[PDB]
Write a protein that binds this DNA or RNA. Structure first.
Ligand SMILES: [Mg+2]
Ligand SMILES: [Mg+2]
Ligand SMILES: [Mg+2]
Ligand SMILES: [Mg+2]
Ligand SMILES: [Mg+2]
Ligand SMILES: [Mg+2]
Ligand SMILES: [Mg+2]
Lengths: 178, 136, 82, 119, 48
RNA sequence: GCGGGGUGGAGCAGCCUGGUAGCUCGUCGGGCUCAUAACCCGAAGGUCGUCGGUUCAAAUCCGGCCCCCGCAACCA
RNA sequence: CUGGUGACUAUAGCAAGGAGGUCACACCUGUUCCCAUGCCGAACACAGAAGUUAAGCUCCUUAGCGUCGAUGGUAGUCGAACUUACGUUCCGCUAGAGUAGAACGUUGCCAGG
RNA sequence: CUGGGGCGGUCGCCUCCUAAAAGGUAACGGAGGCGCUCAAAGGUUCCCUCAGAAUGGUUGGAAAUCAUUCAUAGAGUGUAAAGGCAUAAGGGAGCUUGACUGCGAGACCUACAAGUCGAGCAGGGUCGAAAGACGGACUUAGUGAUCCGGUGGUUCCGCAUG
RNA sequence: UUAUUGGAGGUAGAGCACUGUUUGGACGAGGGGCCCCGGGUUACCGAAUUCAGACAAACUCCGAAUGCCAAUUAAUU
């Protein structure tokens, strides 16, 4: 619980001092992490989705939930109810472990890493990170992976504003592009 | 030629013409306007003729507001046909005008110029008219 | 005599005699149809059943009362006479 | 920013839907169960007259004791049934209150059945 | 559903019910539990 | 009044049965020939008459509009 | 006063500002067990109580919005007389819109304070 | 049938407007659908809430899947339209076959023949802890008399009697 | 038949809350003709939004007069 321990002690102290929170409950926290992989290629080949599912299962350590198309789009050759993606929701200990690994190992492994974007906030204190390849994650092996694929990592924070969210992520040690 | 871009129904019941004007009985965009004192259908052609006449006299120095729009389509049977076998094809587009309705509004000119311009417009229209000003 | 075209209309279904079958304040025996309707313009009330076609019927002998059921809804109920 | 739902409001919506087909007559009064994080409350209600015939709760001193919430629930269910017996109530319709029929809510219901209230 | 089906009680062979099925959707003879009047009990009834 | 058709530059398929633009000629680049034609090789080119509608999706289905074609236009 | 559970067409709502926490209600703490996730103890379920009024919630103020809403007048209209006038007149009924105003709920039962 | 007849069009059924605020109401009046479909798209129990928009994010583009907020229904409801449905009639899952048998007080509609709704009773069941719900489908089209013949069942008849 | 009372229903009128139709104002989400990954500004502003003003047999936030159905209802017939 290294990341959790920091949050409980060091991060909480920094945030409450910074924003003059009246109560400890006010202090922002990361509610959940959702990893989404969109696989439109799955329409062309079912195997592509299967390979993605395995990769996400390895990365997160939990079985992904296959996502089915809400609607049919002719341009994408998409039919409603077709499996075109996979998602995992990480909560509790699993979330902290994944996040610490991302900052500690996976983000460093990113090729030509120049820090993460500071502008990637929804305006409601929620941050989304896009990874170019899943090779960055330590578990994934280059030989095993037939096709390099990107992923969306959404970090949902209880923080009302981006600035409070930015502080929380900075305290966690998330690199920022500045 | 003013006409609706589309309508849900091309063949419609002809409008009720008895009664007095529901709305647009006051000058709201201009200094002066033309008020209808009689009831009649006003065609798109009639509106254009009246519009062209008033703009010419005004010399385009003033601004013209056309209050009435010909929403309702009306049909006519092909020539030399007997009765029945369906309603005819759309022939024109008309606005129902009842007494009190302000047909046009004019601004950016002296009253004298406006009175003449509206007079020229009035002679192009089926209804009888009276020159009117904004009231306070 | 000019030749003539034809209309593509000329069709209508039989009217279904929908609406109220019994008055408010009238005694009805059980099973009496109170209202005929598509959907529920009037909801089934007290001692009133709704049929598969949404017909409202008395489930007991009593007096018919049409009542408000919220701001924009109405119901019909039957109450047994003393 | 992620909103946290109010659990009571959600269950109340669920209760209203249950209430459409469920009502308490004098002959068959409704047994309403309200469950909080710490306590469970039971009321026998006649909906036609809009009156509560009997009540029993964990917060009540007699029922209050050191026990698991399910254990307490059984005690509340036994208590309400005995009180209902005093008022001559044997037939009741169980109102789950919009809560799932499991655990604490079930234990209260089962206890009342065992005591003699007929569901 | 494209075809009319007759369901016969397996035990007594009585053609108690008639129904419809889609032959393409349900190529096999359909079977279902139905009340049999002669038996006065629910029994498996199979399409003839 | 009622049918049919409008698809690379030309002629002609695909529509019935929505997802797929074909064939022959022409055009274009190369070759053969002293040169041309013929012949040989490679290649490009049609928003499917036009506006709308329906549909995830329209050459295809449905409705107007324009153009063209066929048939009918009778009894006094 | 608080809570549970009912009645009523939002005058009851929404929004904004403020206040409140032995109990109660939450948030919350865990997942051993009952039970649960088309992945996730998020939820559901259960076992709890370290912390917290932050939020929900409850209360107070308000009339910005939503809601309610006259009187008077008008449109329309039953009947009648007169007429053929895109009509008139008389009588009864009488809107919609808008205006003044109302309104930040009113209450039944049961258990606690 | 027909604003003479022919020719053209049409013929049953469903929905709307014409229809004059009950119902009903015509023209070769104005608009559209039907001659099905579904083994769940039926029953029940439990659970759930949309479309759209803004912003952030990779393959990813206006638009795929993800996240937050706003969003009262502009979504969905097999299939026309209308009336309904967000206490769902819409969506998901588990279990099922009530898409039961005998019926039926009363009522609607109605020239007749038909057509429609129906509480409740009995038998035997499904789902539910239970109350209870279920005699198809959100409702209203998807259909054709009699005669005759085929097939299955039958404590019915059997031309002196079997 | 009338009086009194209760009810069903959506027409006239009206209105624009919905579905369409429509006039004149402003106004812009976002880049192109335009002036710098280093900013601007004389179309389109089509999205959208807003203020004012109109239209509808198959529009309705509304909504009569009448007519209709009833009442252990009274008067007259
Ligand atoms: Mg009809
Ligand atoms: Mg040559
Ligand atoms: Mg009517
Ligand atoms: Mg009428
Ligand atoms: Mg015969
Ligand atoms: Mg014999
Ligand atoms: Mg009108």
């Amino acid at each position: 619980n290294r990341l959790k321990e920091k949050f409980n002690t060091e991060v909480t102290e920094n945030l409450m001092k910074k924003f003059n929170y009246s109560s400890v409950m006010e202090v922002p926290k990361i509610d959940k992490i959702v990893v989404n992989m969109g696989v439109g290629d799955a329409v062309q080949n079912s195997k592509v989705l299967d390979n993605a599912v395995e990769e996400l299962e390895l990365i997160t350590g939990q079985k992904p939930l296959v996502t089915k198309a809400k609607k049919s789009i002719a341009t994408f050759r998409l039919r409603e109810g077709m499996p075109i993606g996979a998602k995992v929701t990480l909560r509790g200990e699993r979330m902290y472990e994944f996040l610490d690994k991302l900052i500690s190992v996976s983000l460093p492994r990113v090729r030509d890493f120049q820090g993460v974007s500071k502008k990637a906030f929804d305006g409601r204190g929620n941050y989304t990170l896009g990874v170019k390849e899943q090779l960055i994650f330590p578990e994934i092996d280059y030989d095993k992976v037939s096709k390099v694929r990107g992923m969306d990592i959404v970090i949902v924070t209880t923080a009302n504003t981006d600035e409070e969210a930015r502080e929380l992520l900075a305290n966690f040690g998330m690199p920022f592009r500045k | 030629m003013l006409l609706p871009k589309r309508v849900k129904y091309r063949r419609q019941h002809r409008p009720k013409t008895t009664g007095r004007s529901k709305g647009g009985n006051y000058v709201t965009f201009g200094e002066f306007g033309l008020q209808a004192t009689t009831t009649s259908w006003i065609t798109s052609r009639q509106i254009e003729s009246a519009r062209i006449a008033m703009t010419r006299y005004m010399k385009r120095g003033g601004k013209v507001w056309i209050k009435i729009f010909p929403h309702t389509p009306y049909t006519k049977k092909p020539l030399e046909v007997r009765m029945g076998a369906g309603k005819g094809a759309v022939e024109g587009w008309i606005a129902v005008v009842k007494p009190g309705r302000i047909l046009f509004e004019v601004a950016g000119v002296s009253e004298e110029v406006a009175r003449e311009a509206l007079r020229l417009a009035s002679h192009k229209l089926p209804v009888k008219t009276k020159f009117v000003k904004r009231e306070e | 005599k000019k030749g003539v075209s034809s209309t593509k209309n000329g069709r209508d279904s039989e009217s279904k005699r929908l609406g109220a079958k019994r008055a408010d304040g009238q005694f009805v025996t059980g099973g009496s149809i109170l209202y005929r309707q598509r959907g529920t313009k009037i909801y089934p009330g007290e001692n009133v059943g709704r049929g598969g076609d949404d017909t409202l019927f008395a489930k007991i002998d009593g007096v018919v009362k049409f009542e408000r059921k919220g701001r924009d809804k109405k119901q019909v109920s039957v109450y047994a006479v003393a | 920013m992620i909103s946290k739902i109010d659990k009571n409001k959600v269950r109340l919506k669920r209760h209203a839907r249950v209430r459409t087909n469920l009502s308490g007559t004098a002959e068959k009064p409704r047994l309403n169960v309200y469950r909080s994080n710490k306590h469970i409350y039971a009321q026998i209600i006649d909906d036609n007259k809009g009156v509560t015939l009997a009540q029993a709760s964990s917060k009540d001193s007699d029922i209050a004791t050191t026990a698991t919430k399910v254990e307490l629930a059984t005690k509340v269910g036994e208590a309400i049934a005995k009180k209902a017996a005093d008022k001559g109530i044997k037939e009741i319709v169980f109102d789950r209150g919009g809560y799932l029929y499991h655990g604490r809510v079930k234990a209260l219901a089962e206890a009342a059945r065992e005591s003699g209230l007929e569901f | 559903m494209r075809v009319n089906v007759t369901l016969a009680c397996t035990e007594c062979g009585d053609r108690n019910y008639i129904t419809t099925k889609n032959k393409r959707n349900n190529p096999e003879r359909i079977e279902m539990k139905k009340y049999c009047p002669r038996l006065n009990k629910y029994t498996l009834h199979r399409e003839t």
